[PDB]
Ligand binder design. Structure first.
Ligand SMILES: [K+]
Ligand SMILES: [Mg+2]
Ligand SMILES: [Mg+2]
Ligand SMILES: [Mg+2]
Ligand SMILES: [Mg+2]
Ligand SMILES: [Mg+2]
Ligand SMILES: [Mg+2]
Ligand SMILES: [Mg+2]
Ligand SMILES: [Mg+2]
Ligand SMILES: [Mg+2]
Ligand SMILES: [Mg+2]
Ligand SMILES: [Mg+2]
Ligand SMILES: [Mg+2]
Ligand SMILES: [Mg+2]
Ligand SMILES: [Mg+2]
Ligand SMILES: [Mg+2]
Ligand SMILES: [Mg+2]
Ligand SMILES: [Mg+2]
Ligand SMILES: [Mg+2]
Ligand SMILES: [Mg+2]
Ligand SMILES: [Mg+2]
Ligand SMILES: [Mg+2]
Ligand SMILES: [Mg+2]
Ligand SMILES: [Mg+2]
Ligand SMILES: [Mg+2]
Ligand SMILES: [Mg+2]
Ligand SMILES: [Mg+2]
Ligand SMILES: [Mg+2]
Ligand SMILES: [Mg+2]
Ligand SMILES: [Mg+2]
Ligand SMILES: [Mg+2]
Ligand SMILES: [Mg+2]
Ligand SMILES: [Mg+2]
Ligand SMILES: [Mg+2]
Ligand SMILES: [Mg+2]
Ligand SMILES: [Mg+2]
Ligand SMILES: [Mg+2]
Ligand SMILES: [Mg+2]
Ligand SMILES: [Mg+2]
Ligand SMILES: [Mg+2]
Ligand SMILES: [Mg+2]
Ligand SMILES: [Mg+2]
Ligand SMILES: [Mg+2]
Ligand SMILES: [Mg+2]
Ligand SMILES: [Mg+2]
Ligand SMILES: [Mg+2]
Ligand SMILES: [Mg+2]
Ligand SMILES: [Mg+2]
Ligand SMILES: [Mg+2]
Ligand SMILES: [Mg+2]
Ligand SMILES: [Mg+2]
Ligand SMILES: [Mg+2]
Ligand SMILES: [Mg+2]
Ligand SMILES: [Mg+2]
Ligand SMILES: [Mg+2]
Ligand SMILES: [Mg+2]
Ligand SMILES: [Mg+2]
Ligand SMILES: [Mg+2]
Ligand SMILES: [Mg+2]
Ligand SMILES: [Mg+2]
Ligand SMILES: [Mg+2]
Ligand SMILES: [Mg+2]
Ligand SMILES: [Mg+2]
Ligand SMILES: [Mg+2]
Ligand SMILES: [Mg+2]
Ligand SMILES: [Mg+2]
Ligand SMILES: [Mg+2]
Ligand SMILES: [Mg+2]
Ligand SMILES: [Mg+2]
Ligand SMILES: [Mg+2]
Ligand SMILES: [Mg+2]
Ligand SMILES: [Mg+2]
Ligand SMILES: [Mg+2]
Ligand SMILES: [Mg+2]
Ligand SMILES: [Mg+2]
Ligand SMILES: [Mg+2]
Ligand SMILES: [Mg+2]
Ligand SMILES: [Mg+2]
Ligand SMILES: [Mg+2]
Ligand SMILES: [Mg+2]
Ligand SMILES: [Mg+2]
Ligand SMILES: [Mg+2]
Ligand SMILES: [Mg+2]
Ligand SMILES: [Mg+2]
Ligand SMILES: [Mg+2]
Ligand SMILES: [Mg+2]
Ligand SMILES: [Mg+2]
Ligand SMILES: [Mg+2]
Ligand SMILES: [Mg+2]
Ligand SMILES: [Mg+2]
Ligand SMILES: [Mg+2]
Ligand SMILES: [Mg+2]
Ligand SMILES: [Mg+2]
Ligand SMILES: [Mg+2]
Ligand SMILES: [Mg+2]
Ligand SMILES: [Mg+2]
Ligand SMILES: [Mg+2]
Ligand SMILES: [Mg+2]
Ligand SMILES: [Mg+2]
Ligand SMILES: [Mg+2]
Ligand SMILES: [Mg+2]
Ligand SMILES: [Mg+2]
Ligand SMILES: [Mg+2]
Ligand SMILES: [Mg+2]
Ligand SMILES: [Mg+2]
Ligand SMILES: [Mg+2]
Ligand SMILES: [Mg+2]
Ligand SMILES: [Mg+2]
Ligand SMILES: [Mg+2]
Ligand SMILES: [Mg+2]
Ligand SMILES: [Mg+2]
Ligand SMILES: [Mg+2]
Ligand SMILES: [Mg+2]
Ligand SMILES: [Mg+2]
Ligand SMILES: [Mg+2]
Ligand SMILES: [Mg+2]
Ligand SMILES: [Mg+2]
Ligand SMILES: [Mg+2]
Ligand SMILES: [Mg+2]
Ligand SMILES: [Mg+2]
Ligand SMILES: [Mg+2]
Ligand SMILES: [Mg+2]
Ligand SMILES: [Mg+2]
Ligand SMILES: [Mg+2]
Ligand SMILES: [Mg+2]
Ligand SMILES: [Mg+2]
Ligand SMILES: [Mg+2]
Ligand SMILES: [Mg+2]
Ligand SMILES: [Mg+2]
Ligand SMILES: [Mg+2]
Ligand SMILES: [Mg+2]
Ligand SMILES: [Mg+2]
Ligand SMILES: [Mg+2]
Ligand SMILES: [Mg+2]
Ligand SMILES: [Mg+2]
Ligand SMILES: [Mg+2]
Ligand SMILES: [Mg+2]
Ligand SMILES: [Mg+2]
Ligand SMILES: [Mg+2]
Ligand SMILES: [Mg+2]
Ligand SMILES: [Mg+2]
Ligand SMILES: [Mg+2]
Ligand SMILES: [Mg+2]
Ligand SMILES: [Mg+2]
Ligand SMILES: [Mg+2]
Ligand SMILES: [Mg+2]
Ligand SMILES: [Mg+2]
Ligand SMILES: [Mg+2]
Ligand SMILES: [Mg+2]
Ligand SMILES: [Mg+2]
Ligand SMILES: [Mg+2]
Ligand SMILES: [Mg+2]
Ligand SMILES: [Mg+2]
Ligand SMILES: [Mg+2]
Ligand SMILES: [Mg+2]
Ligand SMILES: [Mg+2]
Ligand SMILES: [Mg+2]
Ligand SMILES: [Mg+2]
Ligand SMILES: [Mg+2]
Ligand SMILES: [Mg+2]
Ligand SMILES: [Mg+2]
Ligand SMILES: [Mg+2]
Ligand SMILES: [Mg+2]
Ligand SMILES: [Mg+2]
Ligand SMILES: [Mg+2]
Ligand SMILES: [Mg+2]
Ligand SMILES: [Mg+2]
Ligand SMILES: [Mg+2]
Ligand SMILES: [Mg+2]
Ligand SMILES: [Mg+2]
Ligand SMILES: [Mg+2]
Ligand SMILES: [Mg+2]
Ligand SMILES: [Mg+2]
Ligand SMILES: [Mg+2]
Ligand SMILES: [Mg+2]
Ligand SMILES: [Mg+2]
Ligand SMILES: [Mg+2]
Ligand SMILES: [Mg+2]
Ligand SMILES: [Mg+2]
Ligand SMILES: [Mg+2]
Ligand SMILES: [Mg+2]
Ligand SMILES: [Mg+2]
Ligand SMILES: [Mg+2]
Ligand SMILES: [Mg+2]
Ligand SMILES: [Mg+2]
Ligand SMILES: [Mg+2]
Ligand SMILES: [Mg+2]
Ligand SMILES: [Mg+2]
Ligand SMILES: [Mg+2]
Ligand SMILES: [Mg+2]
Ligand SMILES: [Mg+2]
Ligand SMILES: [Mg+2]
Ligand SMILES: [Mg+2]
Ligand SMILES: [Mg+2]
Ligand SMILES: [Mg+2]
Ligand SMILES: [Mg+2]
Ligand SMILES: [Mg+2]
Ligand SMILES: [Mg+2]
Ligand SMILES: [Mg+2]
Ligand SMILES: [Mg+2]
Ligand SMILES: [Mg+2]
Ligand SMILES: [Mg+2]
Ligand SMILES: [Mg+2]
Ligand SMILES: [Mg+2]
Ligand SMILES: [Mg+2]
Ligand SMILES: [Mg+2]
Ligand SMILES: [Mg+2]
Ligand SMILES: [Mg+2]
Ligand SMILES: [Mg+2]
Ligand SMILES: [Mg+2]
Ligand SMILES: [Mg+2]
Ligand SMILES: [Mg+2]
Ligand SMILES: [Mg+2]
Ligand SMILES: [Mg+2]
Ligand SMILES: [Mg+2]
Ligand SMILES: [Mg+2]
Ligand SMILES: [Mg+2]
Ligand SMILES: [Mg+2]
Ligand SMILES: [Mg+2]
Ligand SMILES: [Mg+2]
Ligand SMILES: [Mg+2]
Lengths: 122, 249
RNA sequence: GAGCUAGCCCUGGCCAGGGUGAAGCUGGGGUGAGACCCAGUGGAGGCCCGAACCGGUGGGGGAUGCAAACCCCUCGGAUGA
RNA sequence: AAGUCUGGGCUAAGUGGUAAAGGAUGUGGCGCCGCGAAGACAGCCAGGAGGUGGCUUAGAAGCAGCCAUCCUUUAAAGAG
RNA sequence: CCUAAGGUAGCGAAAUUCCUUGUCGGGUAAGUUCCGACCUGCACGAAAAGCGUAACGACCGGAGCGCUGUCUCGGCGAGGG
RNA sequence: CGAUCAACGGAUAAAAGUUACCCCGGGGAUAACAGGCUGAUCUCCCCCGAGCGUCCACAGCGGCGGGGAGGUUUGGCACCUCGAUGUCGGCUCGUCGCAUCCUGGGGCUGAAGAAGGUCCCAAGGGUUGGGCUGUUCGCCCAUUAAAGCGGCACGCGAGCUG
RNA sequence: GCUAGUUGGUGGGGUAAUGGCCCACCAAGGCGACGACGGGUAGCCGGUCUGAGAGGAUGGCCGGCCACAGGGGCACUGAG
RNA sequence: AGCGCCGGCCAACUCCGUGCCAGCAGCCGCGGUAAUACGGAGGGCGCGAGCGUUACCCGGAUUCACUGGGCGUAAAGGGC
RNA sequence: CCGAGGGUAGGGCCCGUGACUGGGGCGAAGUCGUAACAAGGUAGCUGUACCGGAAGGUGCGGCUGGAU
RNA sequence: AAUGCUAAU
RNA sequence: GGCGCGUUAACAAAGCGGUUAUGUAGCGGAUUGCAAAUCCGUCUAGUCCGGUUCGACUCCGGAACGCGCCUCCA
């Protein structure tokens, strides 16, 4: 459950460290984003000389949430952070590495290159 | 263009007191040329020196075809002579600058009320029950440019609408009068430049009784005829080099 | 009518505890003598924190009230005009 | 309360029972001309042509813009 | 030209600026407020003092961190009614 | 005979201000809110067809003029209310109109397709979250099918805010 | 101006081996205008280039030494 | 067989073209209608499988002066 | 235990950059004046102070690198 | 008493 | 919008019912190597429209433009 004002850590190597959600790109008026959803976000903290910089407005897909995601098999999964991978308007990652595990829901939702690059899919 | 009346701005370049004196020579050269063209001349701005010349003169050339001919005189004009301000008999190279511009319009400015949006609303500040319930404040929006003017100066919406439209017009006017200036300014700089001894389009060498227009290589030796106004030979050679410049391909 | 309130006059009373550590003093250093430096001691102040006490900052309640100005939280002063 | 009263006409819009410029093969009544079996009006049947364009235009050459719109087999065919 | 003489230093869109959300810069994803500038100061200005200033303030602005039922957006529970 | 007793039937021989510290008697005889009447202003819709649109008045437009509708604005008037009809914005809760923002159905198009323009029908439902400012309004950010405009005492303070 | 393993001691760990190298404790010392500390820059020398010499500049090839082996830390094995 | 150069420093000069233009340039300077200084040409000077240029080091620099400089008025005696 | 490093917070130095602002060097021509060089037309210069569009002026004291 | 004189060997 | 004041030549600015304002500039001359400064001379006028009067820049009325002041209780 990500919404405007929500901070997310960045699970890639674009140079962004913290993005702040400003929109849930999910119809007219989605209240929340979960794993596999895309947000528009402001870049609140970045490391020097990265792809993206502080103040940029970027797009990202959510890859981990602290609110547990439930699964049709009756199970659930929960992460210690809210994390996202910065993408372009074609949904492809903009960095070349993805740090940490990601939800298997991303595979189902066409974020295959991200699933590819993640060290663990859970 | 070619057929409209023209304005000529003669400025003194490098040369000091004698640049202004040469500018006076170019001034008499064009007033007397104009008579030998039927063109009508009137001074619009003059700035004389006590030694006899001008640091700047502006004059119009009222005649059906003035820009077509005078337009070749724009540029830096170089004189080399022993100046009347010189006392050791030396030859000084000095410059005057000629600017040739088509006589602008004067077109009046009114508002196209179809590209204007008027918002009315309640005003801010004191008034009691009146200011609470009255749409006295006005905003006027110039829809193309986007610039707005607001007014709650009075208690009346109609007076604030009138005053707001006035200020909006006055401001769009200054915007129009300023882009016109930036075109006028850059154009002048394309013709007059810095006025340096280079940049010359023509030399009027008094020692060697020569006049050379280094744009086409034309050189006559009727320097007294040139300075008295007989510039038709030079223009034509430019005019003919102009058409031979339109030979494609 | 100054048994409310305001000012002044006379005569009394009150201010838990904790903190900071001025001058001075003493010693040491320094010097021609000094200034001054350092340590210790010392205990100054419309100094600090905080009860009583004096207040009344923000909020909530109260609003035919418990109350014709109150109640709860919070907050200012608290050796000084 | 008192006529589903009598006679003549109009309206088809519930107009009556909420309005203007203006628009209209709504309907009914007057007119005033015109064309008709010298076969009218509508339809169909053809013919509707030619020197072919003149100015303008690479063609605008019957079917852009300009200038007038000359004449034939004839019953008519206009350079439209 | 006029005045008794024509606003100096410093400051300035200000507790002062009507036009005005002036313009530029900063901060914000986005800033009528804020801060830094510019100066055509409607209508600053030198003890109705001018411009600054450590410390102080239950004074009035603007921002960030922390944290939150303020809010998305409400849920449940307690007691007095 | 002495009057700009000119406020000219001329209060004294002799007279200016201020009150947001205000007070009393009065008035809806008289203003400010809201209603009402009106509709100049405002908003919308038509008539005319000069001209634009390469061509072509009418795809889209409409010179100079003309006729209306609405009753959101600014006014005019002063009719209930001055022994009181609480006045902005926000919040909350809606409900209605339709001159329709979206979604549905159309005709025309200067409609190839896709996407638009324009007009017609249509009010069932929908019509986002933020930055600025008390703001209404407006601008901006990120989105959206869309981010409609209006009436209800500019809806709603014996419902809250202030 | 610098300094808390800082400077010295005692005792021990460690090594092939001395040592605050490491540790526990004791003492309050250690260093600096003869430039400590900090900042900048540099691998060093035999040589090499220049120069009358003194000096300056430099350290590529070759020889000697050091340092490093993607960026860091670590030890194992072993005569090393 | 090529490349640099031919105002002065510096060895090597005339003609034309250009007319403060085009350009040369290490310094001082050339070029504004008779330019050994710009561009070509002829001729000349220097080197030659090379010739020039740019960067940098030492030299000239006795211009950081130990060798081997200075401070009245040139930069330089500290106010005492 | 130490520990590569990662993280949190606060300092220090350095570089680049910034609305605007300050003066500085330069220029074959501009505006104002004419302070200095002659006793430069008020000897100059000087530290400092105050003032003035500007060079500058004036006060106080110093110097001669001052004329006759 | 009384200000000034650009710029080409 | 109201009230007040004004419009004069090249600029600035006055008086006045009949009539060279004035300053500076400009123009001619002098002086100066030249230019300034200076000296002798000299010159260009009343915003528009309508009235009054023998006669209007001058007085009255209005128009345009400029300036100064006011626009408050809601
Ligand atoms: K009042
Ligand atoms: Mg991570
Ligand atoms: Mg990261
Ligand atoms: Mg940042
Ligand atoms: Mg930033
Ligand atoms: Mg990425
Ligand atoms: Mg001279
Ligand atoms: Mg409108
Ligand atoms: Mg209002
Ligand atoms: Mg306000
Ligand atoms: Mg008031
Ligand atoms: Mg108030
Ligand atoms: Mg009203
Ligand atoms: Mg008492
Ligand atoms: Mg008592
Ligand atoms: Mg006592
Ligand atoms: Mg006490
Ligand atoms: Mg105590
Ligand atoms: Mg105490
Ligand atoms: Mg303490
Ligand atoms: Mg105590
Ligand atoms: Mg003590
Ligand atoms: Mg003590
Ligand atoms: Mg004592
Ligand atoms: Mg002592
Ligand atoms: Mg003591
Ligand atoms: Mg104490
Ligand atoms: Mg105290
Ligand atoms: Mg206290
Ligand atoms: Mg304390
Ligand atoms: Mg306290
Ligand atoms: Mg008490
Ligand atoms: Mg009390
Ligand atoms: Mg009290
Ligand atoms: Mg209280
Ligand atoms: Mg509170
Ligand atoms: Mg209360
Ligand atoms: Mg209360
Ligand atoms: Mg009460
Ligand atoms: Mg009661
Ligand atoms: Mg209480
Ligand atoms: Mg209590
Ligand atoms: Mg309490
Ligand atoms: Mg307290
Ligand atoms: Mg207390
Ligand atoms: Mg206290
Ligand atoms: Mg106490
Ligand atoms: Mg006492
Ligand atoms: Mg019947
Ligand atoms: Mg009958
Ligand atoms: Mg009908
Ligand atoms: Mg009908
Ligand atoms: Mg009916
Ligand atoms: Mg009807
Ligand atoms: Mg003032
Ligand atoms: Mg003064
Ligand atoms: Mg002063
Ligand atoms: Mg000032
Ligand atoms: Mg300002
Ligand atoms: Mg501002
Ligand atoms: Mg201020
Ligand atoms: Mg002010
Ligand atoms: Mg303002
Ligand atoms: Mg304002
Ligand atoms: Mg703004
Ligand atoms: Mg910004
Ligand atoms: Mg930041
Ligand atoms: Mg801004
Ligand atoms: Mg705010
Ligand atoms: Mg500011
Ligand atoms: Mg300004
Ligand atoms: Mg003041
Ligand atoms: Mg005051
Ligand atoms: Mg005063
Ligand atoms: Mg201040
Ligand atoms: Mg200070
Ligand atoms: Mg302060
Ligand atoms: Mg302070
Ligand atoms: Mg205080
Ligand atoms: Mg206090
Ligand atoms: Mg206070
Ligand atoms: Mg904040
Ligand atoms: Mg925050
Ligand atoms: Mg916070
Ligand atoms: Mg709650
Ligand atoms: Mg809400
Ligand atoms: Mg409950
Ligand atoms: Mg209960
Ligand atoms: Mg009178
Ligand atoms: Mg009377
Ligand atoms: Mg009277
Ligand atoms: Mg009478
Ligand atoms: Mg009387
Ligand atoms: Mg009397
Ligand atoms: Mg009286
Ligand atoms: Mg009174
Ligand atoms: Mg008051
Ligand atoms: Mg008051
Ligand atoms: Mg009172
Ligand atoms: Mg008072
Ligand atoms: Mg009273
Ligand atoms: Mg009273
Ligand atoms: Mg009263
Ligand atoms: Mg009363
Ligand atoms: Mg009464
Ligand atoms: Mg009434
Ligand atoms: Mg009456
Ligand atoms: Mg009213
Ligand atoms: Mg009323
Ligand atoms: Mg009213
Ligand atoms: Mg109302
Ligand atoms: Mg009313
Ligand atoms: Mg009513
Ligand atoms: Mg009506
Ligand atoms: Mg109407
Ligand atoms: Mg109307
Ligand atoms: Mg209509
Ligand atoms: Mg057309
Ligand atoms: Mg058409
Ligand atoms: Mg129209
Ligand atoms: Mg009408
Ligand atoms: Mg109408
Ligand atoms: Mg109404
Ligand atoms: Mg009506
Ligand atoms: Mg109404
Ligand atoms: Mg009214
Ligand atoms: Mg009304
Ligand atoms: Mg009323
Ligand atoms: Mg009446
Ligand atoms: Mg009332
Ligand atoms: Mg009653
Ligand atoms: Mg009643
Ligand atoms: Mg009542
Ligand atoms: Mg509604
Ligand atoms: Mg409809
Ligand atoms: Mg639709
Ligand atoms: Mg549709
Ligand atoms: Mg289509
Ligand atoms: Mg298409
Ligand atoms: Mg359509
Ligand atoms: Mg609907
Ligand atoms: Mg919105
Ligand atoms: Mg914020
Ligand atoms: Mg807001
Ligand atoms: Mg707003
Ligand atoms: Mg607004
Ligand atoms: Mg859209
Ligand atoms: Mg759509
Ligand atoms: Mg209301
Ligand atoms: Mg409303
Ligand atoms: Mg309400
Ligand atoms: Mg209330
Ligand atoms: Mg309310
Ligand atoms: Mg109510
Ligand atoms: Mg009520
Ligand atoms: Mg109620
Ligand atoms: Mg009620
Ligand atoms: Mg209030
Ligand atoms: Mg309040
Ligand atoms: Mg140890
Ligand atoms: Mg050690
Ligand atoms: Mg010890
Ligand atoms: Mg040593
Ligand atoms: Mg390094
Ligand atoms: Mg190195
Ligand atoms: Mg070395
Ligand atoms: Mg050697
Ligand atoms: Mg040597
Ligand atoms: Mg090397
Ligand atoms: Mg390494
Ligand atoms: Mg190694
Ligand atoms: Mg390594
Ligand atoms: Mg590598
Ligand atoms: Mg490695
Ligand atoms: Mg050579
Ligand atoms: Mg030679
Ligand atoms: Mg050469
Ligand atoms: Mg060289
Ligand atoms: Mg030349
Ligand atoms: Mg020649
Ligand atoms: Mg020559
Ligand atoms: Mg030659
Ligand atoms: Mg040479
Ligand atoms: Mg040559
Ligand atoms: Mg060889
Ligand atoms: Mg040497
Ligand atoms: Mg050298
Ligand atoms: Mg020596
Ligand atoms: Mg020497
Ligand atoms: Mg010297
Ligand atoms: Mg001495
Ligand atoms: Mg560590
Ligand atoms: Mg670390
Ligand atoms: Mg500057
Ligand atoms: Mg002088
Ligand atoms: Mg002097
Ligand atoms: Mg002189
Ligand atoms: Mg003098
Ligand atoms: Mg002098
Ligand atoms: Mg004398
Ligand atoms: Mg002095
Ligand atoms: Mg003075
Ligand atoms: Mg003399
Ligand atoms: Mg003079
Ligand atoms: Mg001068
Ligand atoms: Mg002289
Ligand atoms: Mg000069
Ligand atoms: Mg000279
Ligand atoms: Mg006059
Ligand atoms: Mg004038
Ligand atoms: Mg006068
Ligand atoms: Mg007079
Ligand atoms: Mg005169
Ligand atoms: Mg003269
Ligand atoms: Mg003269
Ligand atoms: Mg007359
Ligand atoms: Mg007249
Ligand atoms: Mg007259
Ligand atoms: Mg007149
Ligand atoms: Mg008049
Ligand atoms: Mg009042």
């Amino acid at each position: 459950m990500i919404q405007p004002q929500t901070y997310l850590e960045v699970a890639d190597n674009t140079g962004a460290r913290k993005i702040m959600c400003i929109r849930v790109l999910k119809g007219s008026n989605a209240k929340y984003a979960t794993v596999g959803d895309v947000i528009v976000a402001s870049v609140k903290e970045a490391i020097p000389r990265g792809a993206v910089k502080e103040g940029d407005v970027v797009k990202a897909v959510v890859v981990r949430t602290k609110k547990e995601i439930k699964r049709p098999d009756g199970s659930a999964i929960r992460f210690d952070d809210n994390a996202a991978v910065i993408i372009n308007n074609q949904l492809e990652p903009r960095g070349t590495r993805v740090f940490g595990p990601v939800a298997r829901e991303l595979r189902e939702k066409g974020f295959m290159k991200i699933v590819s690059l993640a060290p663990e899919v859970l | 263009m070619d057929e409209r009346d023209a304005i000529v701005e003669i400025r003194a370049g490098t040369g000091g007191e004698e640049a202004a004196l040469f500018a006076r020579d170019l001034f008499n050269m064009y007033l007397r040329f104009a008579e030998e063209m039927g063109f009508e001349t009137e001074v619009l701005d003059s700035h004389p020196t006590d030694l006899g010349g001008f640091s700047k003169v502006v004059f119009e050339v009222r005649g059906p075809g003035a820009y077509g001919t005078f337009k070749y005189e724009s540029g830096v004009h170089r004189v080399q002579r022993v100046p009347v301000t010189e006392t050791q008999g030396r030859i000084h190279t000095s410059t005057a600058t000629v600017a040739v511009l088509p006589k602008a319009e004067e077109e009046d400015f009114a508002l196209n009320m179809d590209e204007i949006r008027i918002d009315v609303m309640r005003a801010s500040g004191p008034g009691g029950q009146g200011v609470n319930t009255t749409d006295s404040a006005v905003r006027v929006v110039h829809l193309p440019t986007g610039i707005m003017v607001t007014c709650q100066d009075s208690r009346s919406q109609i007076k604030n609408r009138e005053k707001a439209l006035m200020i909006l017009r006055s401001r769009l006017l200054e915007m129009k009068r300023a882009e016109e200036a930036e075109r006028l300014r850059k154009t002048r700089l394309a013709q007059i430049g810095t006025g340096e001894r280079s940049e010359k389009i023509r030399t009027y060498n008094f020692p060697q009784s020569r006049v050379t227009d280094h744009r086409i290589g034309f050189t006559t030796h009727d320097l007294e005829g040139v300075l008295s106004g007989h510039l038709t030979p030079i223009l034509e050679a430019l005019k003919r080099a102009d058409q031979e410049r339109q030979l494609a391909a």
